[PDB]
Design an enzyme around this catalytic site. Structure first.
Site, short mmCIF file in Angstrom:
data_model
loop_
_atom_site.label_atom_id
_atom_site.label_comp_id
_atom_site.label_asym_id
_atom_site.label_seq_id
_atom_site.Cartn_x
_atom_site.Cartn_y
_atom_site.Cartn_z
N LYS A 103 98.90 -121.58 -32.01
CA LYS A 103 98.23 -121.95 -30.77
C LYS A 103 96.72 -121.86 -30.90
N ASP A 104 96.22 -120.94 -31.73
CA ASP A 104 94.80 -120.92 -32.06
C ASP A 104 94.40 -122.15 -32.87
N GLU B 195 65.68 -126.42 -23.59
CA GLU B 195 67.03 -126.90 -23.85
C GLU B 195 67.91 -126.68 -22.63
N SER C 11 94.65 -107.19 -24.28
CA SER C 11 94.20 -108.21 -23.36
C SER C 11 94.89 -108.09 -22.01
N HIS D 253 90.98 -103.40 -29.20
CA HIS D 253 92.22 -102.99 -29.85
C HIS D 253 92.86 -101.78 -29.18
C1 HEM Z 1 79.74 -113.89 -30.37
C2 HEM Z 1 80.24 -113.54 -29.18
C3 HEM Z 1 81.70 -113.12 -28.83
C4 HEM Z 1 82.83 -113.07 -29.57
C5 HEM Z 1 83.09 -113.43 -31.05
C6 HEM Z 1 83.88 -112.60 -28.72
C7 HEM Z 1 85.18 -112.42 -29.12
C8 HEM Z 1 86.23 -112.07 -28.30
C9 HEM Z 1 87.62 -112.10 -28.66
C10 HEM Z 1 88.17 -112.53 -30.04
C11 HEM Z 1 88.32 -111.70 -27.61
C12 HEM Z 1 89.86 -111.57 -27.53
C13 HEM Z 1 90.53 -112.91 -27.28
C14 HEM Z 1 90.38 -113.27 -25.84
O1 HEM Z 1 90.63 -112.38 -24.98
O2 HEM Z 1 90.03 -114.43 -25.54
C15 HEM Z 1 87.39 -111.40 -26.54
C16 HEM Z 1 87.69 -110.95 -25.28
C17 HEM Z 1 86.77 -110.55 -24.35
N1 HEM Z 1 85.41 -110.80 -24.37
FE1 HEM Z 1 84.37 -111.57 -25.97
N2 HEM Z 1 83.38 -112.36 -27.47
C18 HEM Z 1 82.04 -112.67 -27.50
C19 HEM Z 1 81.18 -112.57 -26.44
C20 HEM Z 1 81.47 -112.02 -25.21
C21 HEM Z 1 80.63 -112.03 -24.05
C22 HEM Z 1 79.25 -112.71 -24.06
C23 HEM Z 1 81.29 -111.40 -23.05
C24 HEM Z 1 80.91 -111.07 -21.58
C25 HEM Z 1 79.68 -111.02 -21.06
C26 HEM Z 1 82.55 -110.96 -23.59
C27 HEM Z 1 83.52 -110.27 -22.91
C28 HEM Z 1 84.86 -110.23 -23.24
C29 HEM Z 1 85.92 -109.62 -22.49
C30 HEM Z 1 85.75 -108.87 -21.15
C31 HEM Z 1 87.06 -109.81 -23.15
C32 HEM Z 1 88.47 -109.34 -22.74
C33 HEM Z 1 89.10 -110.41 -21.87
C34 HEM Z 1 90.55 -110.09 -21.63
O3 HEM Z 1 91.15 -109.39 -22.47
O4 HEM Z 1 91.09 -110.54 -20.60
N3 HEM Z 1 82.64 -111.36 -24.90
N4 HEM Z 1 86.11 -111.64 -27.00
C1 LIG Z 2 92.45 -111.62 -30.41
O1 LIG Z 2 92.88 -111.52 -31.75
C2 LIG Z 2 91.93 -111.74 -32.79
C3 LIG Z 2 91.49 -113.02 -33.13
O2 LIG Z 2 91.96 -114.14 -32.44
C4 LIG Z 2 90.58 -113.20 -34.16
C5 LIG Z 2 90.13 -114.62 -34.50
C6 LIG Z 2 90.09 -112.11 -34.87
C7 LIG Z 2 89.08 -112.28 -36.05
C8 LIG Z 2 87.59 -112.46 -35.61
C9 LIG Z 2 86.60 -112.33 -36.51
C10 LIG Z 2 86.91 -111.98 -37.98
C11 LIG Z 2 85.12 -112.52 -36.06
C12 LIG Z 2 84.19 -111.64 -36.93
C13 LIG Z 2 83.21 -112.56 -37.75
C14 LIG Z 2 82.21 -112.02 -38.48
C15 LIG Z 2 82.02 -110.50 -38.54
C16 LIG Z 2 81.24 -112.95 -39.30
C17 LIG Z 2 81.09 -112.37 -40.72
C18 LIG Z 2 79.82 -112.97 -41.41
C19 LIG Z 2 79.92 -113.92 -42.35
C20 LIG Z 2 81.29 -114.44 -42.79
C21 LIG Z 2 78.63 -114.49 -43.00
C22 LIG Z 2 78.57 -114.18 -44.52
C23 LIG Z 2 78.90 -115.47 -45.31
C24 LIG Z 2 78.52 -115.62 -46.58
C25 LIG Z 2 77.75 -114.52 -47.30
C26 LIG Z 2 78.89 -116.93 -47.34
C27 LIG Z 2 77.77 -117.99 -47.27
C28 LIG Z 2 76.83 -117.86 -48.49
C29 LIG Z 2 77.01 -118.53 -49.64
C30 LIG Z 2 78.19 -119.49 -49.86
C31 LIG Z 2 76.00 -118.31 -50.80
C32 LIG Z 2 75.69 -119.65 -51.46
C33 LIG Z 2 75.01 -119.39 -52.81
C34 LIG Z 2 75.59 -119.72 -53.96
C35 LIG Z 2 74.87 -119.43 -55.27
C36 LIG Z 2 76.96 -120.40 -53.98
C37 LIG Z 2 90.54 -110.84 -34.55
O3 LIG Z 2 90.05 -109.74 -35.27
C38 LIG Z 2 91.45 -110.66 -33.51
O4 LIG Z 2 91.89 -109.36 -33.19
C39 LIG Z 2 91.08 -108.70 -32.26
C1 LIG Z 3 93.42 -120.77 -39.80
C2 LIG Z 3 94.15 -119.55 -39.31
C3 LIG Z 3 94.39 -119.54 -37.82
C4 LIG Z 3 93.33 -120.21 -36.98
C5 LIG Z 3 92.15 -119.33 -36.65
C6 LIG Z 3 92.43 -117.86 -36.76
C7 LIG Z 3 91.68 -117.17 -37.87
C8 LIG Z 3 92.40 -115.98 -38.45
C9 LIG Z 3 91.57 -115.17 -39.43
C10 LIG Z 3 90.73 -114.09 -38.79
C11 LIG Z 3 90.00 -113.22 -39.78
C12 LIG Z 3 90.55 -111.82 -39.93
C13 LIG Z 3 89.79 -110.75 -39.18
C14 LIG Z 3 89.38 -109.62 -40.06
C15 LIG Z 3 89.91 -108.28 -39.63
O1 LIG Z 3 90.65 -107.59 -40.28
O2 LIG Z 3 89.45 -107.92 -38.45
C16 LIG Z 3 88.91 -106.58 -38.35
C17 LIG Z 3 87.69 -106.62 -37.49
C18 LIG Z 3 87.83 -105.82 -36.21
O3 LIG Z 3 87.14 -104.55 -36.35
P1 LIG Z 3 87.57 -103.58 -37.54
O4 LIG Z 3 86.88 -103.99 -38.81
O5 LIG Z 3 89.07 -103.56 -37.48
O6 LIG Z 3 87.04 -102.12 -37.15
C19 LIG Z 3 87.81 -100.97 -37.61
C20 LIG Z 3 86.96 -99.85 -38.16
O7 LIG Z 3 87.83 -98.92 -38.81
C21 LIG Z 3 85.85 -100.28 -39.10
O8 LIG Z 3 84.92 -99.17 -39.27
P2 LIG Z 3 85.36 -97.88 -40.12
O9 LIG Z 3 85.92 -98.35 -41.42
O10 LIG Z 3 86.22 -97.01 -39.24
O11 LIG Z 3 83.95 -97.16 -40.41
C22 LIG Z 3 83.77 -96.35 -41.60
C23 LIG Z 3 82.30 -96.12 -41.82
C24 LIG Z 3 81.78 -94.83 -41.25
O12 LIG Z 3 80.45 -95.05 -40.76
C25 LIG Z 3 79.89 -94.06 -40.06
C26 LIG Z 3 78.74 -93.46 -40.78
O13 LIG Z 3 80.27 -93.72 -38.98
#
Ligand code: HEM
Ligand SMILES: COc1c(O)c(C)c(C/C=C(\C)CC/C=C(\C)CC/C=C(\C)CC/C=C(\C)CC/C=C(\C)CCC=C(C)C)c(O)c1OC
Ligand SMILES: CCCCCCCCCCCCCCC(=O)OCCCOP(=O)(O)OC[C@@H](O)COP(=O)(O)OCCCOC(C)=O
Ligand SMILES: CCCCCCCCCCC(=O)OC[C@H](COP(=O)(O)OC[C@H](O)COP(=O)(O)OC[C@@H](COC(=O)CC)OC(=O)CCC)OC(=O)CCCCCCCC
Ligand SMILES: CCCCCCCCCCCCCCCCCC(=O)OC[C@H](COP(=O)(O)OCCN)OC(=O)CCCCCCCCCCCCC
Ligand code: HEM
Ligand code: HEM
Ligand code: HEM
Ligand SMILES: CCCCCCCCCCCCCCCCCC(=O)O[C@H](COC(=O)CCCCCC)COP(=O)(O)OCCN
Ligand SMILES: Cc1cccc(-n2nnn(C)c2=O)c1COc1cnn(-c2ccc(Cl)cc2)c1
Lengths: 126, 248, 93, 123, 54, 385, 55, 93, 50
Positions: free
Chosen positions: F228-229, F272, F206, F202
């Site tokens: 587009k997503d 795998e 990008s 942030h």
């Molecule tokens: C659970 C794993 C990961 C998640 C959810 C994640 C998520 C993301 C997202 C949402 C973006 C911004 C959208 C985009 O630029 O396509 C991004 C960009 C990026 N990710 Fe990841 N990422 C993951 C793992 C990784 C890994 C394994 C690497 C490299 C070893 C990596 C390196 C980068 C870099 C360098 C960018 C910036 C690319 C650019 O802005 O041109 N990320 N990632």
């Molecule tokens: C480039 O632009 C983007 C962008 O494209 C995207 C997608 C995101 C958003 C990406 C994310 C939000 C990824 C982060 C994902 C996580 C942190 C995962 C969070 C973890 C969970 C959701 C797991 C927890 C789930 C549960 C507790 C529910 C399952 C359990 C149940 C239903 C209990 C069942 C029991 C009963 C009794 C019903 C951006 O923030 C963003 O800006 C940077």
């Molecule tokens: C179907 C729709 C379209 C297709 C697919 C697209 C899906 C679209 C939905 C995406 C879901 C939304 C994403 C959620 C979001 O708001 O993203 C935020 C996550 C990024 O990081 P952050 O939480 O902003 O950190 C920001 C930070 O501010 C969080 O940390 P801070 O609060 O600063 O810490 C306070 C604690 C202090 O702790 C100590 C002790 O240090």
């Protein structure tokens, strides 16, 4: 990155050489038109990465007529790619227009940064 | 390794349950339990299959209740703490011939015949391997091989020598519908029955796979249309440059 | 909180580029343009143009690695046959 | 640890006991017949080891079954004397435990079996 | 009519895509099951149970 | 101002997925990061609903996975979506890392964004290994035997990590019970590293396929990139549904349908498909301690990449020699996976050794030499002299 | 229940939910400290505290 | 990002109070003051002074709830004895 | 049995105490039951079977 002082130190030695410029300059002109940046309406100095303090210094010192023209070539090159086309051949950059317009501002920003840094690390005794 | 140590490659027969829209043949599952009960249950178990799962698939309710009653299961003890037996019910599992593993190797010259509940999914080849294993014993081994005492040659087994002899011959069972029980006919029906024992969800799975793929393909086609409508103004945007007058 | 170290991006209004002067832009609404115009003269012709540029940087590294695998594979099948029984010896150890 | 007494192992029964989660080879044999198998010389093999720390109890047989690569498993009572047929990726063996087949760099391990009170603790 | 009487109002716009989500749900579920048990006719348990009616 | 910009919680959603400034020329390779956020949600949700029916004892573990397949209502859908979802999770992550290796995303000022990504990749490999040992098939026992025996070669502390990883003397009941408890936990450490990953994104944003500054033409995230997503999400769920409902055991091994046995070894031990390139690096080194160093050095050599690129242009769009050697490295990584699925025979011990040399020489030799050659070729092809 | 009384399906699903809710609590604790940082703490006097602050 | 809605606290330099003018403050280092001076004249008296102010707002609500529990308890022990056997009847139902 | 050694008895006494009880062993080569005397890793037996 390497530095532009080091690039020109190597690149000038090739051009004041009768047998080296025989071999390398035909290869270098094929590397340019196989890159394809002229077809997007771009010079080479537009492509240089600019997130460093030497490159931010050289962009402030540019004259503002050349600074306005560079901002339009970059905007035209972003709109060209999202349509996945090329520009018409009327609007390609010719080989006479690809001048190093930013190399003199870069080379003197680097010579002042080297001189300042070798005067902070000094071993003058009595 | 050599092709003798890997085993022969099973060919590709045309099973009636191959394809994305096909069902098991429930008349070939019914005849397959008749070959298990008469030829196969003497040495192999079926420990993962309960009695109740056959009702509505290959037999009716009064038949499976009659089938399960000719086996003896151990009951909870009486008022003095002595053991007690009872006949079988629908919630029980199909029994096997041996009480333990040492008694199984004692009747098969050291070898252990495996459990046949998951043998289709645990072999390279699947239905084609179990069919070609049974109808593949030669009348004589190839010239030059030397078998151990108490072995059989089968080229689909890796190594060439197997501890199971040929157990299927012509007209050894008599089917109720009147199908001629040849060697290849009975070998077809065990493999259709044994594939059901590994995958009882097979007909239910391909019907919910139909509803998910039709729904998700009409959602994927509509998202391409919707994206190109909202992206029309950016792709057709234009740009003109007139240089400014130079004393700012 | 306090302001942190400066970056190379801003927000709407102060994004942090050079000053612009003398560029004009025009556009027309999507509700006035015909539905699905750019579906032809583009993957049938344009992605057929973009493939022809960038394919020889893919197919020459692919051909070297598929010649190496197919030629190394057929020497393994020769060594584990009857004709290749003596050459399995004096090679493995 | 498993305790073995001097009463309950007869001569030819190679049972593969699962001691300590690991396979092992346990039987009693005559103290004379290993004069037949390894009468070649000292060092015709890879590593110089014939009889010295082979068995500190000279009239028994104890051997582990963990190999250098994987931990492969043989069949018993089959071979030249009834020894090792281990058809896994390589070597067969003999009464002793050294090779007749395959490359097989390092030797299989002898465990530490001791003698306490006419009882034999293995491991 | 249409969009301002059918796809604009928020108890019609959203009150059709959540109300029509059920009437679509069952007639799509019924018509899929009729095609599947006709393409595979003769092999189900219903077909071979009426053949052992003796 | 609007309510979505003045609330403490709604402003984080607005500043990340609603009003975020994006470069208007990014393509479909920038969609892999959102699709990885959907992959983590599917794996956590389907695994929690399967943990209600699972037993981790070594005499009950294999049969309780069979209980989910046969007895639990729609239990076969939960397992098949879980086992096939892990392969789809690794396929998108290989395409995510290869994009940033192509377009130069690992350079300043995005070095910290690249370093947190390497940590996520190590935790995802550790997660998939721990959960594969919880089925307790015949591949699960001998894959955990081979890996845990590698730590007995560490000098002067060797028989203390391996006896602390086993809880005993071999892979036994204390090993399976502690592997499931660690398998519940590391997916929640990965989700906290994903939050720290998006914070470093942030502050800089990008890149773009042109590789130059993008602060001159920006469009918001909402109503242009959400649709587009949405295109690649519906393509993802349709190809995933074709595997779960029509070919659910194709990305697997039939020896995992045999219960594990410490007294019978399988004729062929193969991991795998996503661990096969790293398995072949291990078997190439004849030493035992040097082999376990090289297999972990194949992931930590990604951190030397900001220092060996000596180029002055960012990306690979206009670089002819650097586009050639990018696809040498790609197909060498597919040759390494094929060697790791073969037997150890003698055309193949030399093919897998030279191909491990091309892996390390790309990062440390080929990149810093080809980078400075194109700096001099761009200079003398322009400067008139 | 997963059945007809408190039985074996009840105990197996209660442990899996017990592993999970402590991680939902830790995410609510992060959101708790965010709402605290924008206004700060009160004091036993109950008046404004912007005239005397220490780190 | 963008600036959000305004609060009632700032940071160092712009904390957001009224403007001050004409107040002076003095202090001496801890390294110059004697170790543990305020340990007497502190809890042996100060906290003995602070208790005596705020105790009667605690002890009067405490005495009502302890009279109610002790008086309600001894009527339960009477009802479950032999002398209270007839009064257990005509009261419970 | 092993938890009593060093708390209330010595090693030779607990080995003698555990040996007057019969425990069930793994079956022989025909699959028949077999008994054995007790060892230190066993648990102290109770009087009733159920
Ligand atoms: C659970 C794993 C990961 C998640 C959810 C994640 C998520 C993301 C997202 C949402 C973006 C911004 C959208 C985009 O630029 O396509 C991004 C960009 C990026 N990710 Fe990841 N990422 C993951 C793992 C990784 C890994 C394994 C690497 C490299 C070893 C990596 C390196 C980068 C870099 C360098 C960018 C910036 C690319 C650019 O802005 O041109 N990320 N990632
Ligand atoms: C480039 O632009 C983007 C962008 O494209 C995207 C997608 C995101 C958003 C990406 C994310 C939000 C990824 C982060 C994902 C996580 C942190 C995962 C969070 C973890 C969970 C959701 C797991 C927890 C789930 C549960 C507790 C529910 C399952 C359990 C149940 C239903 C209990 C069942 C029991 C009963 C009794 C019903 C951006 O923030 C963003 O800006 C940077
Ligand atoms: C179907 C729709 C379209 C297709 C697919 C697209 C899906 C679209 C939905 C995406 C879901 C939304 C994403 C959620 C979001 O708001 O993203 C935020 C996550 C990024 O990081 P952050 O939480 O902003 O950190 C920001 C930070 O501010 C969080 O940390 P801070 O609060 O600063 O810490 C306070 C604690 C202090 O702790 C100590 C002790 O240090
Ligand atoms: C595991 C499954 C996960 C599912 C998702 C995986 C998808 C990853 C595939 C790689 C990728 O991201 O593709 C990017 C690139 C093309 O991207 P581009 O922006 O340059 O051109 C977009 C177009 O011009 C305009 O596309 P437009 O926006 O006009 O229409 C939308 C398009 C949707 O198609 C897609 O989603 C593409 C994935 O509709 C159609 O095309 C109609 C089809 C009937 O593609 C290429 O250049 C080459 C593709 C090779 C893929 C190699 C994969 C190896 C495993
Ligand atoms: C150590 C761990 C690291 C991770 C693993 C390392 C390699 C893993 C391999 C998996 C990914 C396979 C493809 C690699 C990623 C592609 C990203 C990429 O190169 O994208 C940019 C490239 C340029 O294509 P454009 O024509 O759109 O751009 C114009 C010129 N820049 O777009 C292109 O993709 C070019 C078009 C060619 C198609 C690309 C795929 C080729 C198919 C064979 C690849 C093998 C996969 C089995
Ligand atoms: C319709 C009847 C039968 C079928 C479908 C059948 C099927 C099989 C299968 C699939 C295997 C495993 C092959 C493998 O391990 O790759 C096997 C092994 C074996 N079967 Fe059968 N079997 C049948 C009847 C019998 C009978 C009647 C006997 C003995 C009297 C028998 C004894 C054995 C033995 C000893 C093995 C072990 C072979 C070995 O491991 O070398 N089987 N059988
Ligand atoms: C990033 C997330 C995850 C990954 C990559 C992952 C990976 C895996 C894999 C590959 C398997 C083997 C499945 C098979 O081969 O049949 C498995 C098994 C299993 N995992 Fe996960 N897992 C993840 C998250 C979780 C979580 C959070 C839990 C628990 C709440 C969980 C619970 C299980 C269970 C119960 C099994 C049982 C065996 C089976 O179902 O096959 N998983 N995991
Ligand atoms: C795991 C649970 C909790 C944690 C870690 C937590 C943590 C904190 C912390 C660190 C503060 C800072 C001021 C201080 O240290 O006193 C605070 C203040 C506060 N908490 Fe909690 N808290 C928790 C639960 C609760 C609950 C259950 C309530 C009320 C029902 C609550 C309401 C408040 C309020 C109103 C404040 C502000 C008090 C003030 O500034 O005067 N919190 N909390
Ligand atoms: C570690 C990562 C944790 C994940 C954090 C991601 C961002 C948080 C989730 C994003 C969605 C938030 C939905 C909340 C909807 C807006 C709430 C609201 O109107 O703000 C509050 C009311 O909220 C509540 O009463 C408690 C909210 C419960 C949250 C349960 C999830 C109204 O507050 P107000 O209008 O006065 O604005 C003042 C700004 N400080
Ligand atoms: C050997 C084998 C044999 C058979 C199945 C498997 N196996 N283990 N887990 N999975 C998913 C799998 O296929 C395996 C393990 O293979 C490998 C290969 N590399 N690694 C590896 C790398 C890094 C770490 Cl930190 C941990 C493990 C593990």
């Amino acid at each position: 990155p390497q530095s532009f002082t080091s690039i020109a130190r190597i690149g000038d030695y090739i051009l004041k050489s009768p047998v080296l410029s025989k071999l390398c300059v035909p290869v270098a002109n094929q590397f340019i038109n196989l890159a394809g940046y002229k077809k997007l309406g771009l010079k080479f100095d537009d492509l240089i990465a600019e997130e460093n303090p030497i490159m931010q210094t050289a962009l402030r010192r540019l004259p503002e007529d050349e600074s306005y023209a560079r901002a339009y070539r970059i905007i035209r090159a972003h709109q060209t790619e999202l349509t996945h086309h090329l520009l018409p051949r009327n609007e390609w950059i010719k080989a006479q227009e690809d001048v190093p317009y930013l190399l003199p501002y870069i080379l003197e920003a680097e010579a002042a940064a080297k001189e300042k840094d070798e005067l902070d690390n000094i071993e003058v005794s009595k | 390794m050599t092709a003798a140590e890997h085993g022969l490659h099973a060919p590709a027969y045309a099973w009636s349950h191959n394809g994305p829209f096909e069902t098991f043949d429930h008349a070939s599952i019914r005849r397959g339990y008749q070959v298990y009960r008469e030829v196969c249950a003497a040495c192999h178990s079926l420990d993962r299959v309960a009695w109740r799962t056959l009702v509505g698939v290959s037999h009716t309710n009064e038949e499976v209740r009659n089938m399960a009653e000719e086996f003896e299961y151990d009951d909870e003890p009486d008022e003095q703490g002595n053991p007690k037996k009872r006949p079988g019910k629908l919630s029980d599992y199909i029994p096997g011939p041996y009480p333990n593993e040492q008694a199984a190797r004692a009747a098969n010259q050291g070898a252990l015949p495996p459990d046949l509940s998951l043998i289709v999914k645990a072999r390279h080849g699947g239905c084609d391997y179990i069919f070609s294993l049974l109808t593949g014993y030669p009348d004589e081994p190839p010239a030059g091989v030397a078998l151990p005492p108490g072995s059989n040659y089968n080229p689909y087994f890796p190594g060439g020598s197997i501890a199971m002899a040929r157990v299927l011959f012509d007209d050894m069972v008599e089917y109720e519908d009147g199908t001629p029980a040849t060697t290849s006919q009975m070998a077809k029906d065990v493999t259709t029955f044994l594939n059901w024992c590994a995958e009882p969800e097979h007909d239910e799975r391909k019907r919910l796979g139909l509803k998910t793929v039709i729904i998700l393909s009409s959602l994927y086609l509509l998202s391409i249309w919707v994206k190109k409508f909202k992206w029309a103004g950016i792709k057709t945007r234009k740009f003109v440059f007139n240089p400014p007058k130079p004393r700012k | 909180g306090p302001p942190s170290g400066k970056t190379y991006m801003g927000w709407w209004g102060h994004m942090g580029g050079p000053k612009q002067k003398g560029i004009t832009s025009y556009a027309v609404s999507p509700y006035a343009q015909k539905p699905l115009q750019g579906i032809f003269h583009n993957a049938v012709f344009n992605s057929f143009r973009r493939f022809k540029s960038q394919f020889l940087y893919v197919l020459i590294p692919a051909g070297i690695y598929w010649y190496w695998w197919k030629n190394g594979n057929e020497y393994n099948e020769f060594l584990y046959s009857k004709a290749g029984r003596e050459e399995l010896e004096r090679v493995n150890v | 640890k498993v305790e073995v007494n001097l009463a309950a192992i007869p001569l030819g029964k190679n049972v593969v006991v699962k001691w300590q989660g690991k396979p092992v080879f346990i039987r009693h044999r005559t103290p004379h017949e290993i004069q037949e198998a390894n009468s070649v010389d000292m060092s015709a093999l890879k590593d110089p080891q014939t009889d010295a720390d082979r068995v500190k109890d000279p009239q028994w047989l104890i051997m582990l079954g963990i190999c250098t690569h994987l931990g492969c498993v043989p069949i018993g009572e089959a071979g030249d004397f009834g020894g090792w047929f281990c058809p896994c990726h390589g070597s067969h063996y003999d009464i002793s435990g050294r090779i007749r087949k395959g490359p097989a760099p390092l030797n299989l391990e002898i465990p530490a079996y001791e003698f306490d009170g006419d009882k034999v603790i293995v491991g | 009519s249409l969009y301002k009487t059918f796809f604009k109002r928020n108890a019609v716009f959203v009150g059709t895509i959540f109300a029509g989500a059920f009437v679509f749900q069952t007639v799509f579920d019924t018509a899929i099951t009729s095609w599947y048990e006709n393409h595979n006719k003769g092999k189900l348990w219903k077909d071979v149970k009426a053949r052992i009616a003796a | 101002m609007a309510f979505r910009k003045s609330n403490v919680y709604l402003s984080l959603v607005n500043s990340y997925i609603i009003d975020s400034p994006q470069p208007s020329s990014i393509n479909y390779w920038w969609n892999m990061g959102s699709l990885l956020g959907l992959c983590l949600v599917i794996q956590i949700v389907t695994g929690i609903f399967m943990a209600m029916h699972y037993s981790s004892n070594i005499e009950l573990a294999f049969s309780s996975v069979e209980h989910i397949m046969r007895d639990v209502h729609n239990g076969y859908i939960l397992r098949y979506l879980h086992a096939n979802g892990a392969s789809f999770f690794f396929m998108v992550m290989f395409m995510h890392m290869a994009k940033g290796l192509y377009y130069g995303s690992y350079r300043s000022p995005r070095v910290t964004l690249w370093n947190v990504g390497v940590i996520i990749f190590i935790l995802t490999i550790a997660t998939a290994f721990l959960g594969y040992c919880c089925v307790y098939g015949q591949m699960s026992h001998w894959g955990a035997t081979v890996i845990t025996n590698l730590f007995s070669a560490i000098p002067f502390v060797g028989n203390d990590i391996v006896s602390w990883l086993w809880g005993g003397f071999s892979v036994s009941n204390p090993t399976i019970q502690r592997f499931f408890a660690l398998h519940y936990l590391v997916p929640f450490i990965i989700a906290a590293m994903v939050i720290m990953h998006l914070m470093a994104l942030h502050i800089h944003g990008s890149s773009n396929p042109l590789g130059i500054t993008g602060n001159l033409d920006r469009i918001p995230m909402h109503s242009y990139f959400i649709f587009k997503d949405l295109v690649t999400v519906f393509l993802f769920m349709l190809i995933l549904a074709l595997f779960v409902f029509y070919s659910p055991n194709t990305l697997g091994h039939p020896d995992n349908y045999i219960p594990g046995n410490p007294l019978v070894t399988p004729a062929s031990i193969v991991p795998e498909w996503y661990l096969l390139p790293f398995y072949a690096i291990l078997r190439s080194i004849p030493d035992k301690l040097l082999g376990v160093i090289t297999m972990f050095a194949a992931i930590l050599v990604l951190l030397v990449l900001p220092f060996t690129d000596r180029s002055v242009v960012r990306g690979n769009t206009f670089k002819v020699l650097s586009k050639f050697f990018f696809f040498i490295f790609v197909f060498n990584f597919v040759l390494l996976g094929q060697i790791g699925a073969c037997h150890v025979e003698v055309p193949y011990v030399l093919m897998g050794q030279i191909a491990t040399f091309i892996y390390f020489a790309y990062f440390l030799i080929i990149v810093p030499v080809i980078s400075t050659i194109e700096n001099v070729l761009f200079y003398i092809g322009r400067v008139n002299k």
